[model samples]
Target: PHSAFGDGAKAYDVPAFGLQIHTVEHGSGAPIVFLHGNPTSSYLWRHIFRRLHGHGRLLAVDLIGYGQSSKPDIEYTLENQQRYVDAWFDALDLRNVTLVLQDWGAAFGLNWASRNPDRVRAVAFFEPVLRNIDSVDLSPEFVTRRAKLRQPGEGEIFVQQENRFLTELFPWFFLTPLAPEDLRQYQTPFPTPHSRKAILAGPRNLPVDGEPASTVAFLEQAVNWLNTSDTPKLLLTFKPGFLLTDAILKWSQVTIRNLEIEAAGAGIHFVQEEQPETIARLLDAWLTR
Candidate 1:
């Protein structure tokens, strides 16, 4: 039952494409789906969702090419990831879904809900990569860092060869000190430079200044749906956050409707790792109320 990424809960492989996506499912009722983002897996959601043990059917999925999911040789574009993810969701016949998602997980999950609003019950997300963030919103240092990571040769070394996403950047984001085992779980998935492709793909497709024209355009349309959708949504924000900076947070509060914005605690991108208990409690109250 032990996992390198998840809590000691047995994970099963769900049929997805020629590959299989590893998943952890527990409890029973309405489905409460958990989705993690880059460099992490279902592990991010296990502890938090388990707290809602009796609330609903708890399901956590490892995105294709990440976690225990099959690592097929293909460009991990957002569309390709969606194809694999959509297959698994269909296989499970998910409906009335309550999604607990983070990071790139929020991006994909939000977009999915945008298109299939009827199937969704509610969405609670943290630090989501949503419709084209403004370049002006980014601090110069953050902009330069993303720029270097997007550069062809430099990005490979920064992300793939060095595995900085796990080793350096991931840790740097944590407001609290990370334990060794937690670090190992995230690192185990990308043992070699070749394996880090999925991790690297996340930053490359970032929709800034209209670069990556396809993804930017897609997110714009998707976010347009989000801004207009009447679905009950909860946005978890953290102070001193990385992606959800003050300006962006203000923007979300003003622009989006039917969204309850709540502050979890002090953390950066990986807020789930730092405050799972607080997150679980918040979600519990929100989901029940």
Candidate 2:
């Protein structure tokens, strides 16, 4: 598979899941790993990867069932993803790592960090899933959308049959208009209904209405760790960003310890695409400091 972010892409055969996980690597220094969310791959970090050249040892991973990573017949639940990521880290022997997380990346990263706190140097995230449904105040629109996705037959049609999560919903989450080619890159992984198992499974696995007991429990543990950890952290906030709204930002500022929140300009949930240069510059400065 061609990487939109240029060359030097490699794959690792993870024996645990029996899948080859694709990753893009560059530079040489302290390791900094970028983890992308749902429906995106290492391609999402293309611009950031280019700008941060020579800054650090950069590694952007394609999660199982996304990008060039092999999709297998698994549940794709948060627990399963966490296990695969853990196995990957063990295989690579990553330590003192700085993690850049978004969406599902944050979910998986936070859980991993909580369990292996000594290995993590710092964490930088945007649109993090840091709270359970019970603790968070959901917007009416979001609640409605979540409810629709949680429905039995309707959820399948939206996520699987029509694949609106990638084709339609994902675009709406971006403030900057996606270029035609960029959109194509995002859609390349899941071309058919069968291939979209992971894509469809993600929404269904959300702790909406607190259905997935394990995910909610895992998130709770991660958040508890974040509140106490002395690890240096950065939380990038963008105008009108989805999930991490103004209210949540305020909560994070007051709640998460040793965290510095910065504004990355006006954008939606996908701040990396809209403000890649800004994010990279700020991240570089922070890491150096």
Candidate 3:
């Protein structure tokens, strides 16, 4: 596997899942865990990792079937992902964690945080998976994309065979110009159709229209926890047409308690890539404050 994260990368054996989870770490202090979305991995946080070197004990994880992690032959369902990640957390014995989540990371991390409320110190997120979603509330563009990915044969063709998530979809999220080498880091994980099962399964499993009852139910619990908890929360907002648009931002501000929203300037879905330096500075200031 290519070491896009340089010398600090490490791997842990998850005996129960028969998989080896990969991660990269920097500094040494209270854990600040970075979780990434689909079609990307710990590599997504590479830019922000060194920036937060002295800030905390920084760790970024690769979900199974992405990045340098093992891709086992199993249904990459949301439940399974949660199970494995929870095991990883227990193995590391993470406590008083400051979770930085985006996309699928937001869904999985926020849900995990809700269950282990005592362990989480704070949460910082943007372009998240809004648990309470109505199909009618989603933009026409998103609805069309969901329909295309949820279909039987066509979904496989687009995601598995063609690798559209990394090839096509991921590019649209970034407003910044991606370096060729940086793009390769994201694409290095799924070089074959069989290697992309997790990537293919992610979009299909999203709780759009509430079809995935298990996921939506878990998210409901997360929402309740978010509303009740006194944990300091940072909600980063970007421009419209992104995942968390104007309407979603307004709803999140009103509904989620103890939230402090910040405008992260103009950007799309992958604000991490677009505003890495800005985000790093914001996170440092928040955590230190």
Candidate 4:
């Protein structure tokens, strides 16, 4: 198993960012980098990596402040995370890479690929956060719900101390329940309240109201890049997904160039968790192509 994952886990230091990024790498070929987002870690890609062994130079990278990565004392903003990710890629001198991205991970990968066109081979994503929606696009109830999360007291209690984001919401996103071991793998990353800052930062960094203009603006640029890029791209969607809904797919079909959409299966948010085998098979087929 360790041989399949390049003889188990490895940590690479991003000296420019002064922190190490955790990753599992194996096989030999074009670099196939898998990135996860929010309340989850690189562990999300384990099953897929095992299934796709020898398919490529497989890498499942734990984003900074998640999984086995270093927890820096800086604010866990989207831009900061981007900086760290960039440094990690630069440090490795990874070029001509294929990206397997999900959720906020898609945002980072897409944006990075847009900026570093020479570095990417292709991109595959599902359940992506393409852009930050303005609060006006949300319902009053949804706006209120977001407003309450900003309140320090409740936010701290629910996310940091109680860990409701992982404990409650994580299970709800999947059609299939996780194994006890998988649940524990997710839980073990953020055992302390302070260690869970990245979890709390996930929503805020996403910016429902587009409060952080820089990050939101970056996403806008990424969307434009996606709309025009000649780079081959694949979107693995599902029937009635939780995040990338029907309208979003319609928008993607019209807006994105060189984009191929394939249904992975029936799933909600965490499609990888629900249908790892099918998703991996589809990915292998695409990668093989």
Candidate 5:
């Protein structure tokens, strides 16, 4: 595997912000946009890259402030991050895309796809935050961790600052326990505590209250779109310990018409680490279906 902190494989400079965005491309045919979440970069998609790429093309992007992408001094909020997606999609003239999103990836990717629903064909979701109600069951551990920190900070440092929290926290969040190498890769982007400012800012933007009118409005629209869109949707929730499992189940049952939802035997987060192959195959089916 490539070193996490190394110069990423491919890059594009966003003209508007002059930010270099890194990405990895594999396979051919229709493009699959694989978006990773907070504190993780495109690296999270590495395990399934070869398999998914084999059937079609894969465009795994490192959002402007994450991975090896340029870290401009600004808040990496949903709107700012969407511009990077806009720039990349327009630059590549990519369309008929399948968006594979997890965690924060859903927030940004869905927002973009909803606007350009014609260009987006399907969405393969893995534990994505789809609504404000979705954040209901914030883990006690997460709450305690935040309480201790008592101040806003980047997600990368927040994990590492808690004395082996990075190492120990995965089993609680991910499906299977992460291997040492995988864990290292996850932590690679934030080489030092000082470099993790953007990572910390992501969670702070998580819209805990009804404020942040813009973000609230975006999610409201996205939830409605997911329920009504012609775009095929797949919601993959892991078993064992997911904070969002109940919410996902409730939506699948009561709302989200024509959307498919399945359960993976894992944890609340980090489905990539736990079931990479399954995730890839599910996405392949979604892409072809």
Candidate 6:
């Protein structure tokens, strides 16, 4: 088992998707599934992994197309991504999972958790993208940014530019500059420019309206199901950050009252990069207690 990003990291391959996933497994006890955000490999949790390994079993997956995981030349849609997750879980028979998900990971995770509520114990999310409908408006800045990526010829350029959205979206995730090591960890996944197709396509798949939206419909159903279901939920928000913060907070408040939620200033969207110890401690306390 080795990391596709660099040397020293351990990995595992599951034959389900013919995916050789990079993972960090340590400690022993109930399973805790940690899903990494976009452009970041499972290595994002290297520090947190060391902290929580002694408490319980930790499984950090380098999601398909994002990290050291298998990146098959296929459409990176929400449903297809979810299928990969399902296949992984089936292969490992991972039950009673405490999911720590962020960004797109949350979208897929919540969708899966909604279907298998009994299998999930708790979910702690950091800046999760939970909107299934377009009712929640995106900020003008975000709209403009997204538009550049969707416009005619601009779309291709947007993804290939020097600061390619896939590789350079780091600022949106963190407010401060990352160290050389940290930057290397995040950039290690996309070894070649060609490897970025999945990264480039993932965001392009985000649904605009409810009409003809397969992913949105799936998410809408997942949200509706989880809204009334018994799986415990936790919405952890960071300080002034991305535009969807408000919408995410509102959604968590209005829909998941049965679960515990909290809002705190943790330096922005990339809680792990900006406030790794704090976020790790937050989950550590929650999971241990």
Among these predictions, the greatest TM-score belongs to: 1
lDDT of each: 0.81, 0.80, 0.80, 0.78, 0.69, 0.68
Candidate 2 ranges with C-alpha deviation above 4 Å: 1-15, 133-142, 208-213
The lowest-lDDT stretch of 10 consecutive residues in candidate 6 is 1-10
213-248: candidate 4 lDDT, tens digit per residue: 766786787887788888899999877675575666
lDDT for model 1 comes to 0.81
Can you write out model 5's per-residue Cα lDDT over 18-106, one digit (the tens) per residue? 76778777657788888887778888887776666465677888887678887776766777778887888887787888888888888
lDDT of 3 at 151: 85
> Using Cα atoms with residue i matched to residue i, what is each candidate's TM-score against the true structure?
0.92, 0.91, 0.91, 0.90, 0.84, 0.87
lDDT of 3 at 164: 83
What CA RMSD would candidate 6 show? 3.3
**Lowest summed lDDT over 10 consecutive residues: which window, candidate 2?**
131-140
Off by over 4 Å in 1: 1-9, 135-142
> Please, what are the lDDT tens digits per residue for candidate 6 over residues 28-136?
6778888876667677766766666565677888878877777787767777788988888778787788888877778878888888877888888877666643534
Per-residue lDDT tens digits for candidate 2, residues 66-146, read 988888888787878888888878888888999999988998898899999999999999977765554245445656666
**Over the full model, what C-alpha lDDT does candidate 4 score relative to the true structure?**
0.78
Q: 22, model 3: CA deviation in Å? A: 0.2
The runs of at least 3 residues in candidate 3 whose Cα sits more than 4 Å from the true structure, single-residue gaps closed, are 1-16, 134-142
Model 2 quality (TM-score): 0.91
Against the true structure, candidate 6 reaches a TM-score of: 0.87
RMSD of 4: 2.8
